[PDB]
Each structure stands twice: as structure tokens, then as C-alpha cells.
Design a protein around this ligand. Sequence first.
Ligand SMILES: CCCCCCCCCCCCCCCCCC(=O)OC[C@H](COP(=O)([O-])OC[C@H](O)COP(=O)([O-])OC[C@H](COC(=O)CCCCCCCCCCCCCCCCC)OC(=O)CCCCCCCCCCCCCCCCC)OC(=O)CCCCCCCCCCCCCCCCC
Ligand SMILES: CCCCCCCCCCCCCCCCCC(=O)OC[C@H](COP(=O)(O)OCCN)OC(=O)CCCCCCCCCCCCCCCCC
Ligand SMILES: CCCCCCCCCCCCCCCCCC(=O)OC[C@H](COP(=O)(O)OCCN)OC(=O)CCCCCCCCCCCCCCCCC
Lengths: 98, 347, 110, 80, 96, 140, 169, 105, 171
Amino acid sequence: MSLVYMNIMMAFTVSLTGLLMYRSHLMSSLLCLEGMMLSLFILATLMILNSHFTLASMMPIILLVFAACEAALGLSLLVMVSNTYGTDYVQNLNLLQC
Amino acid sequence: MNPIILIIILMTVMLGTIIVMISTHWLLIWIGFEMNMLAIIPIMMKKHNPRATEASTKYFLTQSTASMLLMMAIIINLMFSGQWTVMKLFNPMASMLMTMALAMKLGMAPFHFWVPEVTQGIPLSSGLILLTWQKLAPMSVLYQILPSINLDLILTLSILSITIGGWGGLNQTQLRKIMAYSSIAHMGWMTAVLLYNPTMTLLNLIIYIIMTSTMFTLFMANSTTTTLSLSHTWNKAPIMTILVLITLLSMGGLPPLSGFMPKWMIIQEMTKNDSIILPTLMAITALLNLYFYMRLTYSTALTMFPSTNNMKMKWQFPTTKRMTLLPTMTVLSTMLLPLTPILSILE
Amino acid sequence: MNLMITLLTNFTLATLLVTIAFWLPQLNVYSEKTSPDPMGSARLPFSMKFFLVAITFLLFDLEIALLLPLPWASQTTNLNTMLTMALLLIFLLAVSLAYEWTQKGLEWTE
Amino acid sequence: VAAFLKNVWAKEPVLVASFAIAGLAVILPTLSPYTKYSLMINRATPYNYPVPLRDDGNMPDVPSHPQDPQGPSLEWLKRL
Amino acid sequence: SMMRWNRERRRLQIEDFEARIALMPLLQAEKDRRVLQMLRENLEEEATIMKDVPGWKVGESVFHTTRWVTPMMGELYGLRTGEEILSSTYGFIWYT
Amino acid sequence: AKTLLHQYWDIPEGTECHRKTYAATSIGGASGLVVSAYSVALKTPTSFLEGVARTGRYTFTAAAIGAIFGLTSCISAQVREKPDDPLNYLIGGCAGGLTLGARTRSYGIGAAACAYMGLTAALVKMGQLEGWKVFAEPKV
Amino acid sequence: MMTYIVFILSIIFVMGFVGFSSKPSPIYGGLGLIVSGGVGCGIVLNFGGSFLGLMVFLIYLGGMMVVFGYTTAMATEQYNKVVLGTFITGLLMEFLMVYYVLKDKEVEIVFKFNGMGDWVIYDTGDSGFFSEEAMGIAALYSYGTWLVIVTGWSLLIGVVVIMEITRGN
Amino acid sequence: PFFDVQKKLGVDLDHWMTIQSAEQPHRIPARCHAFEKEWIECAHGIGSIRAEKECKIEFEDFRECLLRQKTMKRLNAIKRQRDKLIKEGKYTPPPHHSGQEDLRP
Amino acid sequence: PGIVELPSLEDLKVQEVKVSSSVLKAAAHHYGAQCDKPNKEFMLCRWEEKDPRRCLEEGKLVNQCALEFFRQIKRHCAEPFTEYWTCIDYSGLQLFRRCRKEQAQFDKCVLDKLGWVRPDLGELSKVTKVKTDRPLPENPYHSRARPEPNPEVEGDLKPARHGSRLFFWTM
Ligand SMILES: CCCCCCCCCCCCCCCCCC(=O)OC[C@H](COP(=O)([O-])OC[C@H](O)COP(=O)([O-])OC[C@H](COC(=O)CCCCCCCCCCCCCCCCC)OC(=O)CCCCCCCCCCCCCCCCC)OC(=O)CCCCCCCCCCCCCCCCC
Ligand SMILES: CCCCCCCCCCCCCCCCCC(=O)OC[C@H](COP(=O)(O)OCCN)OC(=O)CCCCCCCCCCCCCCCCC
Ligand SMILES: CCCCCCCCCCCCCCCCCC(=O)OC[C@H](COP(=O)(O)OCCN)OC(=O)CCCCCCCCCCCCCCCCC
């Protein structure tokens, strides 16, 4: 298939493995999650423009809006963790081991 | 929480699951999962302690990862089919990604690693919603894509869920983690029979939701989250020990109880398809789930652990908690095996 | 293509003026300065209210993103449905504003 | 109900103007004689090519030429 | 004022669209002969290039159907120069 | 690693000992790398050197189990001249169990791994013989 | 070179993700995702997605990543080998993909991929006096009624949900 | 559980965006409208198991319309052999493949 | 698969309308009024055959009828037409509304010397009927045979023989 689709899929997998290998910050995890969402937006957009499938052109905007709402929810969770420990470090989120 | 806001948020949880169940477009499937997660996050943060914020953060991260893998599976389906019908997928890569996404949303092993934490971090009612209502939408999507689900992948997920949910509950003393590892093992049982007969998948899901709702309703009616506080129930309310006895013997699949009903039927549908080793090892691994159920019945009904003195004050008050459908769910989780051929209503 | 030329010219003029502004007084040899804030050394206190107005911006901006195809949407032949859903989206932005109002979310940055 | 209106018009006239403009925007397209013409103009606008019909022999309401009398006319739009 | 002027602008839009409609059969005939010209040129040059290659059928359709498929961009401008490729595939996107 | 098991089963029993031994060694090495990957995943080592030491230990342990399994099974099928016989994989599984006990430096684990892995390898041979399906395709 | 430009932008796009997947700090991570959003927007714009590209700017970058940078600015107090090694690793993996598919005109990571420029697969016609992408987005109000209902309900629920969980009571 | 509420009530909540061959604004066709119409009208009602083997040809034509893998592979072959014969000196382009001929209309 | 059938380059030779787009836009309404019939025959053939290779000759008739349109302008009214398409040609959007007096002079000269009436607002967008002698394409999509459907359900529903037949249950 098309050569640009390779790069958009590979970008999704790069942001996946960034989201699947944390360092310390929860914000870096949220950024990897939104990089995944951005790559999904780009790939859906290039297909829908490429196929001239007219009614799915509203689809990526929906894919934006919901997920950005999702992002807002994630930011609030980070802030609540940041209102508990002072930082957003994921190693402070370990009370549920016992 | 404001009760009007609580009602609107719970109707939004239900509306997300309904939009997953009734829609014919993959974007509306993804939208229903997004709406379900977005509305269920405040139900988990109902009490505002750091454990609920940690549980909601872990739940958000796993369900958001699953939603993004779901949308990548949808987008690859759009690549290789040009359409959006919620049916079989037209690429094994999209099938693998959607099976991974739904195994994450169900918390099947080895994506189980959020289920015992999050259930421990949230209250018992939100744990009831997580372990019963949050299974219905991904099992519906698995119900509709079973022409494209790889056999080896879903059976590996099934046996790994049954074994890990067996060995996980053997070390536990918290009741919510016990119900969570029980959840993992039962989801393994439900997806092991998905490609063979999905009616028995629906049967196992309904019987599991009845038994789980019975156990969480008993845990709420007695205000018990640990084994050792459940062991004070005989000195407070001796009927509840008999109820947790018969319901924990039913969740272990001991006949003549109703929880013997699914797994037997599952074996009954896996030997027709000439699989003998697999339901045998599944049923042998279910003895682990039975073992920690028997541990709880020894702690609660069949012996009497020592109580404290302040229990004498709690004798002077009856339970004013709304035990909604608790006799109904107790009957329907124990005495239902003579009505086993009712399962054809799920065909 | 003309747009890419124009963006490159604007970026090049901006980078040129920034390089000139950062390196024209560096040619002077003025002195080396030692120089050993209202807050003394205290950590940045988080305010919940700035985060609430930023999230309220994001949510109303998503509602704006839904509202943006209206000048093209008015050209449809299903005008009753288009008008109903347009008034419904502006009404849901208004209901989000009213719920943000009446639960004290717009307070001390009103 | 009249004292409430003067009270909120003295205290919060921005919100009174807001709910008044919003209420007019809601109810007034269902009361206007020109709302029919918006639909009529949007369906009179030819974005597409008017793909012709194969003449079978019995279509007296379909013209053979654009300057034929039968067919949809737009004198209502030229006049208004 | 906006009522009168937008109604006149809609009448002007309909006049422009009717001019477009009246010109479209000439443009469609020219476009059909244009794309068949380019495909026949590509077919003849494919015939005079792909002679050494074993088992090559010149003009072999990749579709099992015998229906006319609308030609792709690379099917028309694949053998031509990259300047015509750019001026036929990014020009409207890049035009100002 | 689906082709690993196929190139293990493609050689007939008691015929080519070296490539059977190498195929079982490679299958054990793949399984040991899987165990090593999940082990350094869920349990963080204190260093990179400790992590690769755990990885090499588990990989060499499982590879030695596979090597001595395939060697003992093929030599038993050679000297007994019985290729379709699950007693050969019984002795091979017990040899791999003694290998696991020597790697864990303990005799009780060795006898347990002998018994259970010998029964497991006998069951795998019987499933190869009578066509037992564990991932059975849906037929009805 | 200019016939490959969308592909070239995609390369920068992948490099941009290796900018923040290596996770140097959430602030440089936000900067890398902003640059990635701009170049992926350019990819969208070079197919004719003008409205969708300006949604990448206005709503993703100008709306959402502003809130990411804003929230990040209210954490991580203002003043690696792992980031450097992962960055050069992703760089080398992407340029090895580039080298393979440019010397072979075919590659196969998971699927087969052509090595020509992606201009080849476009359409050779016109849309008349409209943009097809614009009319398909404008049909959100005519054809997308249920989609508008569930989207607006999710946004209203999102406002309510943020005001619940951020209250702390 | 696909509770088919849309067919039970007769409402169209999401069938309109489901296929490319559906009703589109201003009757804009998809680039693979005809192939998808043929694949759907082949595969309609006969079930998916019979559709995978009795309608494979229309599905292959439709997938090859969508992704153009055979077309791009054929253009790769022609362009690669063409540049190889340019390198060998055995081929020269015509004037109408160099831009010297004042195009048609 | 099979070999695609392209027509020869001789089958694509026709006398081209080598005028600019403002010349075409200035003459557009009279072109739609006068060159109605072969244009609509061609576009009927073009939407029915779904193949340009089955539509060449009618297309040539379009390119035959356009030229006879322009010669009949070039013989009689070259000055008002030139003065009108130049003014149409000035505008970057080629507005009709900027050029109403040159339009009025061109319409006056054409209606006097040729009797052509300019079409009113609404007329050129009508759906017209076309009487052709070419046949209707019976399979314009070149569709092959469709598969036979599965056999439907018929017969009155009898009860289940011995009930569920589940292991020991008699009902
Ligand atoms: C003029 C118009 C009006 C005309 C009226 C005509 C009638 C007048 C009399 C009205 C009353 C009629 C009653 C129904 C008809 C007779 C049904 C019957 O006896 O079936 C025998 C049934 C089958 O034996 P059969 O000799 O082949 O059939 C004789 C007839 O042809 C049976 O006929 P069939 O072949 O058509 O039967 C169909 C099928 C026949 O059965 C089968 O095809 C085999 C499958 C049966 C279920 C096996 C499940 C095994 C696993 C679970 C075991 C649970 C634990 C056992 C009990 C523990 C303690 C509660 O039935 C079922 O599958 C339904 C399940 C069994 C329900 C039987 C009716 C119970 C109603 C009262 C319940 C009270 C509690 C009972 C104990 C709870 C367990 C049932 O026997 C058993 O399954 C053994 C267990 C006994 C069942 C209950 C017996 C009913 C009377 C109970 C009175 C004592 C209550 C003491 C206090 C409460 C318990 C502590
Ligand atoms: C093919 C199948 C398709 C689908 C079929 C239908 C599936 C239905 C699945 C139902 C799942 C129900 C999940 C629980 C109910 C949802 C709301 C909830 O959790 O309510 C609990 C409520 C909260 O009150 P609160 O005050 O917060 O409690 C804490 C005390 N301080 O109140 C309490 O805490 C009070 C304690 C009692 C609450 C128990 C409510 C149980 C209701 C469900 C019964 C079981 C399901 C129905 C039967 C099976 C149907 C398949
Ligand atoms: C039906 C059409 C569509 C309607 C929805 C869309 C409207 C568009 C505008 C959206 C506005 C969104 C936010 C509105 C929130 C209203 C509630 C409110 O603000 O109550 C609090 C306020 C007292 O103010 P306070 O709490 O102190 O806040 C600081 C400012 N002083 O209390 C007040 O100030 C009292 C204000 C309420 C009474 C207003 C009456 C206006 C009457 C206008 C004419 C009739 C209009 C009929 C339409 C329906 C009216 C209900």
C-alpha cells in the first residue's frame, strides 16, 4: 500500500511503545497517548480524503473531539495526583499493591 | 455527590454501553466506549481519597490505551474494507488489535494487571459496576466479530486468564481483590467458548453477573471489605453467612448450584468440537477459584471467628440498607440448575 | 507552494531578527556581572482555578469545533434538521456554561 | 410575573437580553413566512449536472429543451 | 439590506452554476478524449518498453471486471515528467 | 515460534539426533527468553548486568532442559528402535526434570520436575500419535 | 524531491514522535508533539484536507496542546542517556526504513508498502464548486443528527465530570 | 448482544456513514463506488461464510480499487524497466513524455 | 486478467475548441440554449454507458456543435462578443455582474442578428428528456451472475421432539 501510511502507522507504534514504557511523569504518558490519537487522526484523514468518502469527513473531527475530551479528563486525573504528592510521578501511584 | 448528577452520570454509563450494543458503525462503538469510561470515572472517585484517584488513573490509562488500539483496528478495517459495518474484520492485524483492545477492556490476562488494583481502590458499588456492567459492551463487540477472531489468540487469553485468576486469589485477604481475580478467571471461561458457541458465552456472562452482584450486594449489606471483617458476620447477622456460603459454593461451580451451569455447558460445547485436553485443564484450574472460595466459607459460615465487645451495640440496630434484589439474586445464583435448558432464550 | 515560500520567509526574517537581537550586543564587552522575586525560594503553589478555566476553555473549544461547519451547513436541503441541531449545539454550550456557573465553577476568576 | 421581569431587567440585563434573543431565535423561524423560501432556494441551486432522462415516449412534464414551458421555473425567486 | 443582497447573490450563484452546467458537456468530451489520449500513449510506450520482460501482457488490466475503471494519477502521468506530475497533482492544493 | 515446533516434529524419531537436539535447544531458548522478558518486566533488576544475568540464567536453564530432553529422547528411541513410543519421551522428560533440578541445585525439585515433565512429554507424544487437539478448530 | 514532499513530511512526523516518545521532559515532549502536529497537519493539507488541517491547528494544537502545556507549567518545577539512546535508536530505525524502501521501491514491516511517491494514487477529476471534504463535514447537521446528539451529550457530561472529580468533596 | 434497535424501530442512527456507496451530499461518488456496490450486491443476504468464497472476485477487485497494490506494482515494474533501459541506452522517451507537444484541449 | 481495450489515436482526433474559459463563460447561456440536443445526447450516453470509450462519437458531435456555435458568432457578432468576453476575462472570479452592459450589447446583437433568446434563471438547470436511437445498456456495470440466496424458512412450526433433549431433561 501507500508509502505515507507506513510512516503514520510507524508513528502510531512509536507513540504506542512510548506509552507502553513509562519513565517517570504521568504527563509524558498523556503526551504519548495524544500522539497516538494524532496519528489516528492523520491516518483516518488521509484514507477518507484518498477514497473520496464524503460522509466520513466528519469522522476525524469526532475522533478529535471525544478524545480531546478524554484528554481533559486525563489532565484532571493528573492534577488530582499532583494535588496529592506534589508531583505527577507514577511511582507514587503504588498504594494498590496491598 | 448530588443525586441528580449521580443519576445522570449512571444513565450516561448505561447509555455508553447501549450505544456499543445497538450501533452498526465502528465510530459509534468507539464513541460508546469513550462515553462509558468518561462517565464511569466519577463513580470510581465517589469518596475522594488517594486510593480512588490512583485506581481511576490506572483505569483511565488502561481503558484509554484499549480505546486507541480499538480505533487503530477500526482504521485498519477501513483500509482493507473501505466501510464501517460492525461485523467481521477484513484483516487479521485489525482482528488481533481489536482482540487485544477488548481483552484490555475486559481485563483479561495478561492485561489483567489493572483489575485487582482498581477494584481495591474504589468502593464496593463502583466495583460492582466495574465487574458486572463494564463487561457487557466488550463482550458484545466480541460477540459480533467472532468470524474474524483468531482461535489461538483468544484461547491463549482464555487459559491465561483462567490460570492467573486462579493463582491470584489464593494469596488474598481483601474481598475486592478476591472478586477481581474471580472476574479474571470467569472472563477466561467466557472467551474460551466464544468461537465454539457464543450462546454459552452469554449464559456464563449472565450467571456470572448474577453471582457477582449477589456477592457485592452481600458485601455492601454487611459493610465488609476484608475476610476478617466478613468473619464477624455470624455474630451480627447469621443469615448472611448462609447466603455467602451458598453463593461462594455456587461461584466455585459445585453442583447442584447455578454456577455449575455455565462451565459444564462450556465443557459440553468444547467436546463437541473435539477439544478434550483444553476443557479438562480449564476445569482442573477452576479448583483454585473453588479453593479460595472455600477459604472464605471457612472464615465466614462454617466456623465462628471471635468477635469484639462493641458488636453487642450493633445487635440493637437492624440493617436499614436497601438490599436491592438480594433475595432474588440469592435464589437465582443458587437454585437455577433444574432450569438449565432455559439457555435457549439466549440463542 | 507560495504559502510555503511565505512561511519560510516569515520564519527566516524572525530567526534573523532574533539572531541579531541576541548577538549584536554580545559584540560589546561591557562587564562580567555577578548579581548574587516576591517568593523567596518557595515551590510554585498550584491553583485549582487556573486549571478549571483552562479545561473549561478546552471543553467549550471542542463545542466550538462542532459549531465551525455552520456556514456550510446552512446550504443544506434538510434545513429543519440542520436548524434544530445547530440550536441544540449552541444550547448545549449554553447548558455547559450554566452548569459551570451555578456550581460555583466560575468564581474568583468569574 | 411582571415584577420579576423588571427586577431581572434592573439587576441582570445582559441575561435578560440573552434569553430574549435566544427565545426569538428559537421560536421565530417557525413563525416566519420566509422560512419556506430558504428551503426553496437551497433546492433551486444547481451544484450538480442535471442528468437527462431517456425519453421513453410518455413524459409530458419533462421538457426537451431548457427554454420549453414545462419544468420547474424560478420566477418566484426573480420576483420574491 | 442583507436580505435583499443575499437573495441577489443566490441568483448570481445560480447564474454561475448554469454557466458551468452549459459548459460541462464540452469539458466532459474534452476530458474523455484527454484521458484516452494519455492512456493510449502510455500503452504504446509500454509496448515498446516491456519487450524483454518475460510473461508481460501489455495493457493487462489488474481488475477481473471488464468495466471501465476511472484512471489513477500514476496511470496517466507515470511515464511523463515530474514537472507535469506536480502541475497535475499538487497545483490546486498549492495554488495561492 | 510456530515453525520451531514444526521443525522439531518434522524429523522422525531416533533418526537425526543432532538437529532434534538443536531444535529442542532452540525451543527451550525461546521459552527461556520469554520467561526472562516477563521476569525483568514484572520484577525490576537492580542493574543492567543483573538483568542480563537473570536473562542468561533462565535462557541457559531452559535451553539445557530442551537439549537434554531431545538428546535423551532420541538416544532412547535409537537404542530401543521404537520411534512411536511415549516411554522415550517419558525418559526424556525425566532427564529434563533432572536437568532443571541440577540448575536449581536441588533434588526434590529434580524429582518433581522429572515426574511431571515426564508425564507431560508422554502426553505430548500421545497427542502427536492419536491427534489430540488443544487449540481445536470449531467444527459444530 | 518535491514529488515526494508528503512522504518527506511524514518522515519528519515520525522523527517528531521520536522527539517525545523518548520523553526528555513533558515540556520538550509537548514541544515535539506540537511540531509533530504541525507537520502531520501539513500532510493532511497536501491531500486537500484544509478544514481538517486547520482543526489540527485550532483544536488540537491551539486548543488542546495549550491546555497540556498549561497544566505542565503548573507542575514540574523549573530549574539523559536513556532519552539520547532511544532517540538515536528511533532515528536509525526510521532512516533504515527510508533507505530500504527507497533502494527497493517496496518494503514489508507488517504490510507491503510501495516505494514511489504517494502522488500516484490520487484522483484525476474535479469536485465542481465545492470541496467534498467541506460538504461532508457540513452534513454533520443534516445527516449526522445522532452523532451530534451523542457528541454534545458527551461534552456536557465531560463538563459535569470535570467539575465533579476536581472538586475533591 | 447486538440488540438491533435501529431495525426494530425503523430509525437510521448510523447506517448512512457505514458504506461509501450510500447516499452522499451532492451525490458525490466515492472513488470505489462501483466496486463496493458490486461486492455488496454479490454478498447481500447469503451470509458471511458463503460470501467469503462465492464473492471473492468482487472483493479482490474492490480491495485493489481501495489500495491499488497491483496497480502500483505494475507501475513499479514499468518504471523500473524503463529507467533500466534508459541506463542501458536502449530506450528514449517520446516528445509527449518529455513535455514538448502542447497538450490536447 | 484481460487486456484493456483502448481506442486508437485516430479515434481521438477532433477539431478542438481552442478558446479560453472566459470566452466559454461569456457564451455559456447561448451555448446551453443552442447546443442543447447533442450535449444532452452525449451526457445521457455518458451517464448510461459509464465508459468514455462508448461515448466518443457523440462527444465528437459536441465538438462539432460547439464550433458551429462559435462560427455563427464569429460571422455576425464578433465585436460585442469580443468586447464582452474581454470584460468577463478581466475579473479574477470572472463575474457576470461586473459586465452587464457588455452582456446587454451582446444579447441585443445576438437577438437581432440570430434570434437567440438567452435562457432565464432556472432554465439551464432543468432535467430534460432525450430521444436517442442507441440502446439502453442492459449490464452497464458488467456484473456477473449473482449467487443464489439461502433457502428460506417454510412450514408450520411443530413442537420440539421430546423437548430440549438436554441430557436428562424431558421438557
Ligand atoms: C385439569 C387442569 C390441571 C391439571 C393439574 C395436574 C397436576 C395436579 C397436581 C399439581 C402439582 C403438579 C406438580 C408438577 C408435576 C410433577 C413434577 C415432578 O414431580 O417431576 C418429577 C421429577 C422428574 O421425575 P420423573 O419421574 O421422571 O417425572 C415424573 C413426572 O412425569 C413429571 O412430569 P414431566 O416429565 O412432564 O416433568 C418435566 C420435567 C421433568 O424433569 C426432568 O425432565 C428432569 C430434570 C429435573 C431437574 C433435575 C435437577 C438436578 C439438579 C438440581 C437438584 C436440586 C436439588 C434437589 C432438591 C433439594 C431440596 C429443595 O420437569 C423439570 O424438568 C422441572 C424441574 C423439576 C421441578 C418439578 C416440580 C417442582 C414444583 C415444586 C417445587 C418444590 C421444591 C422441589 C425441589 C427442588 C428441585 C426440583 O423429579 C425430579 O426431578 C426429582 C426431584 C423432585 C422434583 C420436585 C417434585 C414436585 C413435588 C414437590 C413436593 C414436595 C416439596 C417439599 C418442600 C420443598 C422442598 C424442600
Ligand atoms: C445479554 C445481556 C444483556 C444485558 C442484560 C442486563 C445486565 C444487567 C447488569 C446489571 C449490573 C448492575 C450494577 C449495579 C447497579 C448499578 C448502580 C449501582 O452500583 O448502584 C449501587 C447503589 C449505590 O448507592 P451508594 O449510596 O453509592 O452505595 C454505597 C453506600 N454508601 O446502591 C447500593 O450500593 C445499595 C446496594 C444494592 C445495589 C445492588 C443493585 C443490583 C442490581 C443488578 C441486579 C443483577 C442484574 C440483573 C439480573 C441479571 C440480568 C442479566
Ligand atoms: C429558551 C431559549 C434558549 C435558552 C437557553 C440559551 C440562552 C442563551 C444564554 C446562555 C446563558 C448561560 C448561563 C445562564 C445561567 C443562568 C443562571 C444564573 O446565572 O443564575 C445566577 C444569577 C445570579 O447571579 P450570581 O449567582 O450572583 O452570579 C454572578 C453574577 N451576579 O441569576 C440571575 O441572574 C437570574 C437570571 C435568570 C432569569 C433570566 C430571565 C430572562 C428573561 C428574558 C425574556 C424571556 C425569555 C424566555 C426564554 C426562557 C426563559 C427561562
